[PDB]
Ligand binder design. Structure first.
Ligand SMILES: N[C@H](CCC(=O)N[C@@H](CS)C(=O)NCC(=O)O)C(=O)O
Ligand SMILES: N[C@H](CCC(=O)N[C@@H](CS)C(=O)NCC(=O)O)C(=O)O
Lengths: 214, 214
């Protein structure tokens, strides 16, 4: 059974964990916590990761790091990243704007004074989701008609704002229907109820928004 | 001739512009400026980019966006992103820590009070470059022995700190020799002197560090 490390936090281990349940890989999970930043620290340089970090992926064959890198290569195992250079480019281009989001926000989800930086950024939040949904146009999923790794990227970001921007999450139609579809899919849906799902937090205890223990 | 859009700024168009000169693609350049955020704004939704942004790449075949996405697909044209899923994963994993840098800093390069956030982060700066160079181990280039797209990513970030952390840029041996090698390579080196090279700034006029007109 593979292995996905990270602390009990939706952090950036959600899409990657979701992507595994969707593609039912019997993986193991290496959870972390607050009582364990040090419990982790000392280990950060043992599992031997060319570029240590979290979430880390341990395989009998590969030892990768980087949420995305820990997804991309797990997509090749199922050859999902397309085939033709053209189309193979549209898959990454998306994860580009899939991190553009979480990144442009992640920096602001642990700092005390996020609020100030939060206050006016919502001016652009509809804008980003203006082209994000406009782009979602009318298709079933991000890249066409079949759930690809990038789709859970953009999903966990939405259900992420569903906790501090619902007023605007509803502001956009298409993207609204979206959230439900992923929540619809088979084991994904069942996962969203299983004994091994991470509900709260969604950013990490040590933070003001989306953070917290319970 | 292809096309790479961005304002006269090393921004995130340097590695991608460098990667093209290395692989001598006869590209065109769509420069932007301060007198042109609006000159750009109005155009942001015309060249038809599923997910508008900068730097944008215009081809007769593909219209991509995202510095990296604008690089990856331009690597497939030269099939450089490896071949075996295993090795093909090590290429992205790197660009992961190639953005980890510029990102963990980019957020801090335009804000007035970066200094405060700059002050103590340098505590980790050696750490990151501790495993960044340790990883660079003893090989010619990041991914083995041949300059891949990820190599200019990590190069422009170093020559980026060469302007506000030299004290520490020297702190690390390996990575130190590095900067010179890229500067060594053929047309890359010649590019670092050509009539079409971007010297200053390296982050964007509207900013305190690395920014500025002249
Ligand atoms: N962009 C992230 C880079 C990693 C990252 O910054 N890791 C965080 C999550 S916010 C971690 O928990 N850091 C622990 C560490 O510094 O050792 C990725 O692709 O994994
Ligand atoms: N991570 C960047 C996302 C884009 C980005 O944030 N673009 C900036 C550069 S700092 C741009 O100049 N923005 C113009 C815009 O908002 O239209 C990428 O891959 O291109």
């Amino acid at each position: 059974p593979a292995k996905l490390g990270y602390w009990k936090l939706r952090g950036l281990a959600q899409p990657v964990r979701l992507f595994l349940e969707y593609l039912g890989e019997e993986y193991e999970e290496h959870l972390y916590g607050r009582d364990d930043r040090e419990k982790w620290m000392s280990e950060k340089f043992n599992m031997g990761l060319d570029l240590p970090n979290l979430p880390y992926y341990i395989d009998d064959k590969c030892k990768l790091t980087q949420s995305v890198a820990i997804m991309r290569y797990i997509a090749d195992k199922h050859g999902m990243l397309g085939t033709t250079p053209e189309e193979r480019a549209r898959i990454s281009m998306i994860e580009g704007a899939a991190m553009d989001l979480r990144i442009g926000f992640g920096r602001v989800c642990y700092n005390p004074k996020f609020e100030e930086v939060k206050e006016e950024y919502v001016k652009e939040l509809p804008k980003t989701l203006k082209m994000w949904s406009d782009f979602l146009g009318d298709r079933h999923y991000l890249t066409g008609s079949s759930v690809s790794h990038v789709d859970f990227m953009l999903y966990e970001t939405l259900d992420s704002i569903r906790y501090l921007a619902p007023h605007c999450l509803d502001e956009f139609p298409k993207l609204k229907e979206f959230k439900s579809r992923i929540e619809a899919l088979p084991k994904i849906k069942a996962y969203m109820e299983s004994k091994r799902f991470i509900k709260w937090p969604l950013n990490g205890w040590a933070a003001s928004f989306g953070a917290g223990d319970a």
